[PDB]
């Protein structure tokens, strides 16, 4: 829903964790302002020079423990956005949620990846929230809130990563 637009923006590991993994009131998600990096990522049959940046972060259900009383454990899923340069010709259908963008004869592949973080929080069932699903996150973050044609929306990639050795691997 349009609840996605209401989500605030966070910057830095502890700010993202601090906002989401709140025991008193756990939060569904937040947008992430992050650094763009450049390096090889394997998709399909080979490696592609890929631009990567965090874009969103959301709470994920770990477990529900028994008692005296009913407790709920949450984890943070960090969502990254990628531009796998030249990958769009052979991997246009590799992901359920993806976009293609032409740069001359070259076809870039725009997709999202999720990384589960280690930090967890124990919340009582009375304070528990309904977590967002990976399908909804991809639809709102990439499909509805990012335009590869103009590199704009709720986020944009910093292409200067290609020229920064600190942001290259």
């Amino acid at each position: 829903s349009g609840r996605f637009d209401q989500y605030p923006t966070k910057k830095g590991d502890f700010a993202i964790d601090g906002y989401l993994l709140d025991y008193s009131s756990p939060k569904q998600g937040c947008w992430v302002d992050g650094i763009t990096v450049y390096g090889d990522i394997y998709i399909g049959k080979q490696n592609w020079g890929t631009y990567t940046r965090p874009v969103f972060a959301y709470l994920q259900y770990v477990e529900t423990i028994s008692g005296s009383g009913t407790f709920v454990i949450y984890q943070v899923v960090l969502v990254y956005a990628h531009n796998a340069t030249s990958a769009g010709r052979q991997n246009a259908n590799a992901f359920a949620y993806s976009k293609t963008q032409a740069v001359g004869s070259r076809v870039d592949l725009y997709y999202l990846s999720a990384i589960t973080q280690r930090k967890r929080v124990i919340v009582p069932s009375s304070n528990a929230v309904t977590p967002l699903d990976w399908d909804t996150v991809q639809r709102n973050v990439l499909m509805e809130n990012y335009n590869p044609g103009s590199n704009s929306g709720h986020f944009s990639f910093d292409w200067s990563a290609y020229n920064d050795p600190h942001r290259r691997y």
């Binding site: 080979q46 490696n47 020079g49 340069t85 030249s86 010709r89 052979q90 740069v103 290609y162 020229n163």
Partner: peptide
Amino acid sequence: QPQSHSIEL
């Protein structure tokens, strides 16, 4: 415009 070093096949 995004720069690339990617080599197909």
